[PDB]
């Protein structure tokens, strides 16, 4: 009989990387080295784009207390590409550092900084005891304690209206059930570790299908075509054979999808050229064999493949098992280990597309087109 | 500086249909010979779009006014213009349109397009005067009368100088889609030749993206800037505005819908349906086709 014994696939012979031609340096010093960090209610926003960012320096600086990363490992930040990076900074006590994580409820979390549940990015926190704390006390950092409702994620509230705790309207005047909109921080060296100043910086990444500008430190190789190669275009990776495609891309488009789950085409970042992506090759491997009664010779069929590719598909490296045995394509694949014969017989081991194999006389496995029966004429 | 306008009068507003008008490319992906169902903020089919005449004519003698009221900005705006002499010249966006809060301005003041994001002090009637025939010879001469003071110019874009030259029925259609999400301002546009139309005709055209801007401000209301073909003290004999209000513009509002876009073999959108329009469109969307059998 014929037995489906395994599956075969052509292995990737090379890996290429293509990244944009930006050669700038991101100003990570300014956000981190800034002498004056913002208040809790106001914070700050500093967009970062069109520069390469070496996140290894910040990870191994060892000057930061926390490096908890959400949705991405800190070690792999170098390899990735983002459209832009948002940097926000403020000053928080030691005990309130926990309230910066998503999906948590706390005074800072509810009234000052709400992070979204589906938040990608990292938070950087380190103590600023010798910078933001004074003997007389740094009261320039404010506290929001009482708000009408919980703030939406990534929302800034600056209004200094005197909120109403009771039924009487404050009308912008303090008094009964009317409190100062923004309390002050007691930053003094006498305070404990949980009350010491901590400078907190949050980095939020945008992993969107758009041109990237904050790609990390990496080198770009050359474009090799018409071979099975690992590719990495603007951060998206995969494997396939890439050729020259004639699809008329619109100037604002980057990818191409026909079945909505496979990117059949892509645009090279450096040279704005469009090249399609196709899977390398795969198929099933079947072994045509007579019984261990008759002999031990076998034949192998690589199902549904062009088999100029078979010798380099996938130590058990028989490849072309018997190169002397004339290989020949059928509609089912090409058969290796069998000899083609013009004579037709009744089928005993079916192969497909009218081709049948048998073991006969000296004796060897042969391949032929099946005969439908003896001819007759009434 | 800003100067006032004299004669106002009134005329009740008009409306028009918008059958298959105002479709843009949602994402940046290439599709071929496949119909694909998306979900975004589109202008619903057969919508009621307010109609404004650029020159608010009381009578064809020459009694005029500008019709540029401040309008809301609800989750985006579809804007179309039908004109033949470039009367429309830009828009102003913001919340209060004064010095209290920031406001975006996109004005094509003849020489070059100027995008700014500053705390302008807008007057009640912003307009750009054109002394097309005021001087002895016949040549366009512009005027900038939008705001009074500008501060905190966070963003600024200017274009390379260009001059409009004409040297009267070749009207032009210019569709625009404005959208403001996650602190980004989006502009889509298209241009289409047309001739001798009283209002916007039916048909289909897909609006391609033109720019994505990191303005990141609050937008709730907006206005329109129009070219004043006259002066304000004493323009001339009569018929100050061009052709007594033939220039006009329409405003529609985007809503969360679900369309079934149809891409042809060249990757351009050719037709679409609105799923929540009528039962037949519901059947087409559920069946994922443009034709339904019995």
């Amino acid at each position, epitope marked *: 009989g014929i037995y489906q014994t395994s599956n075969f696939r052509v292995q990737p012979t090379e890996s290429i990387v293509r990244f944009p031609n930006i050669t700038n340096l991101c100003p990570f010093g300014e956000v981190f080295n800034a002498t004056r960090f913002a208040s809790v209610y106001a914070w700050n926003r500093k967009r970062i784009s069109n520069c390469v960012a070496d996140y290894s320096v910040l990870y191994n600086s060892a000057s930061f207390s926390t490096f908890k990363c959400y949705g991405v490992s800190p070690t792999k930040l170098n390899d990735l590409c983002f459209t832009n990076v948002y940097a926000d900074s403020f000053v928080i006590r030691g005990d309130e550092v926990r309230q910066i994580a998503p999906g948590q409820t706390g005074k800072i979390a509810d009234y000052n900084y709400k992070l979204p549940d589906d938040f990608t990015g990292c938070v950087i926190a380190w103590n600023s005891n010798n910078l933001d704390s004074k003997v007389g006390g740094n009261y320039n950092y404010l506290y929001r304690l009482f708000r009408k409702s919980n703030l939406k994620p990534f929302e800034r509230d600056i209004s200094t209206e005197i909120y109403q705790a009771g039924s009487t309207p404050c009308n912008g005047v303090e008094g009964f059930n009317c409190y100062f909109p923004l309390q002050s921080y007691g930053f003094q060296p006498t305070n404990g570790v949980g009350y010491q100043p901590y400078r907190v910086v949050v980095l939020s990444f945008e992993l969107l299908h758009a041109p990237a500008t904050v790609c990390g430190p990496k080198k770009s190789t050359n474009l090799v075509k018409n071979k099975c190669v690992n590719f990495n275009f603007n951060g998206l990776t995969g494997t396939g054979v890439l050729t020259e495609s004639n699809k*008329k891309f619109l100037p*604002f488009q980057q990818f191409g999808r026909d079945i909505a789950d496979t990117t059949d085409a892509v645009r090279d970042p450096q040279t704005l050229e469009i090249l399609d992506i196709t899977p390398c090759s795969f198929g099933g491997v079947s072994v045509i064999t007579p019984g261990t009664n008759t002999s031990n010779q076998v034949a192998v069929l690589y199902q549904g493949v062009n088999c100029t590719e078979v010798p380099v598909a996938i130590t058990p490296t028989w490849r072309v098992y018997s190169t002397g045995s004339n290989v020949f394509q059928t509609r089912a694949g090409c058969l290796i280990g069998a000899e083609h014969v013009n004579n037709s017989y009744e089928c005993d081991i079916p192969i497909g597309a009218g081709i049948c194999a048998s073991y006969q006389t000296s004796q060897s496995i042969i391949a032929y087109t099946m005969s439908l029966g003896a001819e007759n004429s009434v | 500086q800003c100067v006032n306008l004299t004669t106002r009068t009134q005329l009740p507003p008009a409306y028009t249909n918008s059958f298959t008008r105002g479709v843009y490319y949602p994402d940046k992906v290439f599709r071929s010979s496949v119909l694909h169902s998306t979900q975004d903020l589109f202008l619903p089919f057969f919508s009621n779009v307010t109609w404004f005449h650029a020159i608010h004519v009381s009578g064809t003698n020459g009694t005029k006014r500008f019709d540029n009221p401040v309008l809301p900005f609800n989750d985006g705006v579809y804007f179309a213009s039908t004109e033949k002499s470039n009367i429309i010249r830009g828009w102003i966006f913001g919340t209060t349109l004064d010095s209290k809060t920031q406001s975006l301005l996109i004005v094509n003041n003849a020489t070059n397009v100027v995008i700014k994001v500053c705390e302008f002090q807008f007057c009640n009637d912003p307009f750009l005067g054109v002394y097309y025939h005021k001087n002895n010879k016949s040549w366009m001469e512009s005027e900038f009368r939008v705001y009074s003071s500008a501060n905190n110019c966070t963003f600024e874009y200017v274009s390379q100088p260009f001059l409009m030259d004409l040297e009267g029925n070749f009207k032009n259609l210019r569709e625009f889609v404005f959208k403001n999400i996650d602190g980004y301002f989006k502009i889509y546009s298209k241009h289409t030749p047309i001739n001798l139309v009283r209002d916007l005709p039916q048909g289909f055209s897909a609006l391609e993206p033109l720019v994505d801007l990191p303005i990141g401000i609050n937008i709730t209301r907006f206005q329109t800037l129009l070219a004043l073909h006259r002066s304000y003290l004493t323009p001339g004999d009569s018929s100050s505005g061009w052709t007594a209000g033939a220039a006009a513009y329409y405003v529609g509002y985007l809503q969360p819908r679900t369309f079934l876009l149809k891409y042809n073999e060249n990757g351009t959108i050719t037709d679409a349906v609105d799923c929540a329009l009528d039962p037949l469109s519901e059947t087409k969307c559920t069946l994922k086709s443009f034709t339904v059998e019995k």
Partner: nanobody, 117 residues
Framework: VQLQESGGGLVQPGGSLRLSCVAS???????MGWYRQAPGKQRELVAQ???????HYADSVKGRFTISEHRGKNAVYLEMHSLKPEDTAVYYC?????????????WGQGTQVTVSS
């Protein structure tokens, strides 16, 4: 985002460079010209080509640089010859996409073409 441009190249005086500010797709315009900028001075016109075929040239560019366009390719092409160090600058290509009757040029994406021995 629309269009994008890329390229560049260093060169020794007396050489010739062929840079096309390759368009990211078939686009419509009215005057697709070439500009340049070196640190220390304001940005100047180099040469322009319109849809009709008029080729405007700056005062210091006659007889040395010419611009061509490939409609079947959708790319402008400035043929720059007989380079001198004074030509050193970061080179750009503005686009004349019609916006509100013309404007919103796309010269921001440019190339570096420096002439030095």
């Amino acid at each position: 985002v629309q269009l994008q441009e890329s390229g560049g190249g260093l060169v020794q005086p007396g050489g010739s460079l062929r840079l096309s500010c390759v368009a990211s797709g078939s686009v419509t315009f009215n005057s697709m010209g070439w500009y340049r900028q070196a640190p220390g001075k304001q940005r100047e016109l180099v040469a322009q080509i319109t849809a009709g075929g008029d080729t405007h040239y700056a005062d210091s560019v006659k007889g040395r640089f010419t611009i061509s366009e490939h409609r079947g390719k959708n790319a402008v092409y400035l043929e720059m010859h007989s380079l001198k160090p004074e030509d050193t600058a970061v080179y750009y290509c503005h686009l004349q996409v019609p916006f509100l009757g013309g404007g919103y040029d796309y010269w921001g994406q440019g190339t570096q073409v420096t002439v030095s021995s």
